[PDB]
From a paper:
Abortive infection (Abi) is a bacterial antiphage defense strategy involving suicide of the infected cell. Some Abi pathways involve polymerases that are related to reverse transcriptases. They are unique in the way they combine the ability to synthesize DNA in a template-independent manner with protein priming. Here, we report crystal and cryo-electron microscopy structures of two Abi polymerases: AbiK and Abi-P2.
We also obtained crystals of Ll-AbiK that diffracted X-rays to 3.1 Å resolution. The polypeptide chain was first traced into the cryo-EM maps, and the resulting model was used to solve the crystal structure by molecular replacement. In all subunits, the DNA’s 5′ end is covalently attached to the hydroxyl group of Tyr44, which for the first time demonstrates that this tyrosine serves to prime DNA synthesis in Ll-AbiK. Tyr44 is located in the middle of a long loop (residues 21–57) that essentially lacks secondary structure elements. In the wild-type Ll-AbiK–DNA adduct crystal structure, downstream from the first nucleotide that is attached to the tyrosine residue, the DNA strand makes a turn and continues through the channel between the polymerase and helical domain toward the active site, which is formed by Asp163, Asp247 and Asp248 and is located close to the center of the hexamer. In this channel, nucleotides −2, −3 and −4 (numbering in 5′-3′ direction with nt −1 located near the active site) are stabilized by stacking interactions between nucleobases and aromatic side chains that line the sides of the channel (Tyr142, Tyr245 and Phe299). Interactions are also formed with the phosphate backbone (mediated by Asp141) and with nucleobases (mediated by Tyr145, Lys295, and Asn346). In the crystallographic data a continuous electron density for the entire DNA chain is only observed in one of the subunits of the hexamer. For the other protomers, the electron density contains a gap after the second nucleotide.
Author numbering:
A (entry chain A): 0 to 188, 191 to 599
B (entry chain C): 150 to 188, 190 to 299
C (entry chain E): 0 to 188, 192 to 599
D (entry chain D): 300 to 449
DNA sequence: CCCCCCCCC
DNA sequence: CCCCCCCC
DNA sequence: CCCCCCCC
DNA sequence: CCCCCCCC
């Protein structure tokens, strides 16, 4: 029944290996049988809107976890205050949203706690009746099903009321969590479940309390419980509504029903320091607006056949992209995100010949220079949140017959033509800390083997402060892929960065508790694998006259010296086990060549 | 499509009554140069002007529209406009008097407008300020004929 | 010079006795001579917009400070975390603001620190160039002078960019105060700012979300924060004018605007500040100016004392409508000008004392219209006008308006609108619009309104979700009625004290918890024996309370409560105040809880 | 009818304040579509002085007082106003040329304008280079003319 | 104290 | 030169 | 000419 | 995995 199939989903999700194999990057699997014991690093089962699975994933760390028990490292209390990877992405054309990717250690510390107390989450979730985000887009709980749950919650409503909470994730006071779960008066009196959660959550953001570290499934799960206690307080007051995260739909029929619900709603926000986004408060009167019909979109290619001209397919695809971008302008939320899936599905459904698919996306018209793949590429450069979608779209038409080389050339030519504008855009993303925008360009260059855009001086200028770890890793990979460039200059800019950021901390702080922990692990891993010639390391170390001991060179570059520095080594000893067992957090590639297409 | 690449926004710019208010004596200016024109006959530019005015009783207000010769002369004029703008590292798409300027920073839209207005004042061209508009991504497009066809 | 007048302002403000006598309730005095050694019981020298001076003031505590030195009592470490008075006021008809009135002990600890390190405030203040809010509306630094400063900052500007920070005080992340004063990266590693943060948190029970807003100390702390925001923008060759969180950036080219916005956002993103995108506008020249009061101040330029009293009634009544409509159009603060210019016009036009009584206490037999009843009714449409209305009444009282006639007029209002007022009272309770409640209760105690709430309705005010101030007023209302038995009131107060202590570690001292003001008010009265000690021992024997060396072992007995906590630094502070007969609430001239002349 | 209530008896500060308040009133009036309101600033300030018969030394101090607290000067505000529309170049200069004959010391007029140029030297040069590049002829003429006049 | 009166959080 | 003042 | 059709 | 594709 309903109670049965609910618990199947939750007994599945609440598993430490699942919450890092798919939770760290907020990935989602449709079927349980996709949780293979193999690494399965090449192909994608699940999807995510965040980071490229091929270059950044946990499949190596996951395969370690089902062969080794790591809870030993976390069984103690008093967790370590680690610094996350601050990664800032856009919200509109003129607004932003701040992700924080927590240090893997303090993440697993929080992960194991949530699982050791799965009951305090699950039994509240299954009893809850208003939330359509408590499924986390997981398993068979797709968009049509969350929509269908909302429809039954809005019966009897001549009108609908909308409320959105303003910057809910990033303005959340962490100490509000014991208030919502246990009661504000009960928390004023220590060492409970809510209190221990609060201290583990802040451990992932260097003990700061303004906001939650958003960007992973754990934050999603913790956020859903906080709002499910909201839902429970409103159920006591005999209210009924639908809710997806911070977005409410209250159905009513008389103005007083609305004002009653509005007042009891404000009392809960006042009590828990939540701010109602007033620009988004709206009452919909029947006949009800609904500007989200995808029927016209999904039926765009109805009258096209495999027998249609390759030029016909080119024009219709290009036509279709413009139709959806216009539909998003009219308020059809998600219409642009649908461009990639339906082009993929339509080619498959119409069974276009694999040779004919190459021509469609390879054809550069010598009359107008139009290549439809170039158009899709340029589209994706208009919202860096489309990065994974464009890359999996290429992945799909690639395995359909689009020449990996043809695609690499088209992308190369696009960068060549827009060289001036992209350089200008990079300097902007660097000065104003637009991470994902810089990430997208760097990820495109490493993936499509682009080498003409930046020189070595312009590449080393990327290895600097106020750059996310993901961009640094990508920029490092770009430097290494040119064999002509000498590693000596790269080691200076990297070591200079490592010393500079370690200086801001207390001198007794372990380096794996600091910033740049992911880029640090990436470097130490490549160094232990000796991608950096141990000789070419000693050459640099002697240009700075670095003292030496039995650990090796006393440099931030040497992991063996770093592995011991600091009073609390629980983090260093954590990432130590990972380096020894050659667990990677960044994927070298199929041939370990840092090439990512076939 | 390929001209508008890299643009998170696109600026629209339409000249006002371009065909009917076009000063014929500005045609030599665009092809050769306003300064050079002061120096003054027998040139290709100046003779083209005289063959044009001769079609409309030696009047210089506007070009006689309705035929293809006027379209061709209008393109040549407007292409020397394009070259002056190309020289200044600007990129856009124009159909006759209708410009589409893709950009990403308001600094660019300003740089572009400043030089655009400079050529317009030099050659007695008028911007139709009613049709000036920027489109922010996601871009509107109402020109679709898919459901019609 | 310009810095000559600043240094004199700040050497005066940054004095701990001034910062509580005029800063706790955010008062303002126009002359340094107004800081008299005497307790100004009947002189409202200062101006405030928060709490009625005649009832809630620090003049007695200020008097104790001039004699004793409490810097000795406060020197130490790890300050005690106290719970403030949560007092919620409106922002507009549909919005609210959250004032937090800090425990006196925690407040004074912050006050002494700021003064011992006034150097770190004053040095940044004098050096500042962009802030017109850094004068805190004191001395000869009036609105016209601040506008004159802004005008010279907007020269060379064809356009003005307007930028407002969203919910600034309440959303201000406290730990970001070290970030702005000494840098964020350096803060990863217990200096000046690192301790100012922990003194601030201890005023709001170690909450790090928001600043205790409603007093001068928080305005100065907020000012340092933004004055460092200013130094960062000054290093980038930017010029603008700022008042608290509202910026005006003059510019000419769209280059300069986007240049300014990009840096502005970086500073904001770094310190968890949020920009109110709705109040973001650009004014092109010719510039709008919807805030000119020239027509308001010259409203009475045509009327004289020779004119009929009925004409004065009409022009005043038509003047109130002119200003309320001008506030509608955007002339910000126009309603706040109604009371001053009426008072200043009456004085300047030299209106006789007997005429003022008749102008303001006349009842039209035809229309039942009384102009003072109108002004009162206006004051109840925005509870942030309570102090304005009472100081206005205080002024026409001294000019002739009979205290008796005024009390009768308000009494009549409350009788006509018993239905509505009792609806609004029970509304403000259920939604913690606790200022709107404080106003009604304050009008009742001041104007002697004994016919609105019965005994039961008053007792039902002594509950939770009621702020200390309205609690004190509701208790006063009960006491002002002799026929109400003091026994029932105790049972509501004892139950209330008992219920809020249950929310704490049993080792927590009561004077560190919530309701610290109401507790002090009650304890002071019991020590003064206002609560008949025979009538106290009667109630305790009813509850079968045990009796010990200090007393009857209840929340009501201060001698027992005095020392029942792990950290008694708070109780020991308030105990000294009770012993020396320092009052935080004025019992009145004859201690009859009456406040009219 | 803006200055009708004020007379010679009022303090120079009052006069300075009221004139400063008056410039804002007309500027806002022009913003509302009151065509010509800004061009009326200069005559009615001149003519109000005549009708009210303010003493010569008061004219100097009104237009020379640098308020020690705010460092505000009402003549400097008038000057900054004229640099917002080049077509006010003559109506500002006749205004000075008028109050110069009313008792305003030219040595102070020159000193006040020179301070403005010293203060906004970066901005003014930035604006000059922008006028040459875009062939804005009157805007440049204004700055150059103020330089030679003052 | 010796005319004024208004911005915010 | 003998009160004013502003439209294009 | 050999499943298109529309912009100033 | 066995006519789907989209919300924060
Ligand atoms: Mg939101
Ligand atoms: Mg046209
Ligand atoms: Mg604000
Ligand atoms: Mg504000
Ligand atoms: Mg046209």
């Amino acid at each position: 029944s309903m109670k049965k199939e609910f618990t199947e989903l939750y007994d599945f999700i609440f598993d430490p290996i699942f919450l890092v194999r798919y939770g760290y990057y907020d990935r989602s699997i449709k079927n349980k049988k996709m949780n293979t014991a193999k690494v399965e690093l090449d192909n994608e089962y699940g999807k995510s809107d965040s980071f490229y699975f091929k270059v950044f994933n946990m499949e190596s760390f996951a395969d370690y976890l089902r062969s080794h028990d790591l809870k030993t490292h976390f069984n103690g209390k008093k967790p370590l205050s680690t610094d996350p990877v601050y990664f800032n992405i856009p919200k509109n054309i003129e607004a932003r949203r701040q992700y924080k990717m927590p240090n893997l250690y303090s993440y697993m510390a929080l992960n194991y706690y949530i699982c050791d107390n799965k009951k305090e989450f699950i039994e509240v979730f299954i009893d809850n009746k208003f939330s359509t985000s408590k499924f986390f887009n997981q398993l068979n709980f797709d968009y049509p099903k969350t929509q269908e749950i909302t429809q039954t919650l809005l019966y009897g409503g001549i009108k609908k009321l909308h409320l959105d909470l303003s910057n809910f994730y990033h303005t959340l006071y962490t100490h509000s969590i014991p208030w919502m779960i246990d009661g504000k008066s009960a928390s004023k009196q220590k060492k409970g479940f809510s209190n221990t959660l609060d201290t583990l959550i802040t451990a992932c953001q260097y003990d700061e309390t303004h906001g939650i570290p958003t960007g992973n499934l754990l934050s999603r799960i913790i956020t859903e419980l906080y709002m499910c206690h909201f839902d429970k307080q409103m159920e006591y007051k005999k209210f009924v509504y639908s809710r997806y995260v911070d977005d409410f739909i209250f159905p009513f029929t008389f103005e007083n029903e609305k004002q009653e619900f509005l007042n009891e709603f404000n009392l809960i926000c006042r009590e828990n320091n939540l701010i109602i986004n007033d620009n988004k408060t709206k009452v919909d009167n029947f006949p009800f607006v609904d500007k989200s019909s995808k029927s016209d979109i999904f039926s765009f290619f109805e009258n096209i056949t495999s027998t249609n001209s390759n030029d016909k397919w080119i024009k219709e695809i290009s036509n279709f992209i413009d139709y959806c971008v216009n539909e998003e302008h009219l308020g059809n939320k998600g219409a642009i995100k649908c461009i990639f899936p339906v082009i993929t599905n339509t080619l498959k459904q119409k069974k276009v010949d694999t040779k004919n698919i190459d021509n469609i996306f390879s054809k550069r018209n010598m009359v107008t220079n139009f290549n439809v793949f170039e158009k899709i590429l340029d589209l994706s450069l208009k919202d860096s949140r489309l990065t994974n979608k464009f890359l999996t779209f290429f992945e799909n038409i690639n395995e359909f017959g689009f020449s990996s080389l043809s695609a690499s050339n088209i992308v190369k030519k696009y960068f060549s033509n827009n060289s001036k504008g992209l350089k200008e855009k990079i300097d902007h993303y660097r000065k104003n800390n637009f991470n994902q925008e810089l990430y997208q360009i760097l990820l495109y260059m490493v993936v499509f083997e682009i080498d003409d855009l930046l020189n070595q001086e312009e590449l080393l200028n990327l290895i600097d402060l106020n750059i996310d770890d993901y961009s640094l890793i990508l920029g490092t990979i770009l430097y290494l892929k040119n064999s002509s460039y000498k590693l000596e200059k790269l080691l200076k800019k990297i070591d200079q960065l490592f010393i500079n950021t370690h200086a801001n901390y207390d001198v007794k702080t372990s380096r794996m508790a600091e910033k740049l922990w992911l880029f640090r692990y990436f470097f130490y891993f490549l160094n232990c694998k000796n991608i950096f010639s141990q000789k070419e390391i000693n050459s640099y170390c002697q240009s700075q006259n670095y003292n030496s001991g039995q650990n090796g060179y006393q440099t931030e570059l040497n992991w063996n010296y770093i592995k011991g520095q600091g009073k609390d080594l629980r983090a260093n000893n954590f990432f130590n086990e990972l380096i020894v067992k050659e667990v990677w957090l960044i994927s070298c590639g199929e041939n370990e060549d840092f090439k990512y297409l076939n | 499509q390929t001209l508008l690449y890299g643009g998170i926004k696109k600026l629209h710019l339409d000249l006002s009554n371009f065909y009917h208010t076009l000063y014929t004596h500005s045609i030599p200016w665009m092809i050769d140069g306003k300064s050079a024109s002061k120096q003054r006959k027998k040139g290709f530019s100046n003779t083209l002007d005289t063959l044009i005015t001769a079609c409309q009783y030696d009047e210089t207000h506007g070009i006689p529209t309705g035929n293809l010769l006027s379209r061709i002369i209008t393109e040549l004029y407007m292409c020397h406009f394009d070259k002056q703008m190309e020289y200044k590292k600007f990129v856009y798409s124009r159909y006759v008097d209708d410009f589409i300027f893709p950009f990403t920073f308001e600094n660019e839209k300003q740089e572009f407008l400043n030089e655009f207005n400079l050529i317009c004042r030099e050659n007695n061209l008028i911007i139709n300020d009613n049709k000036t508009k920027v489109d922010n991504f996601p871009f509107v497009d109402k020109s679709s004929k898919s459901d019609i066809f």
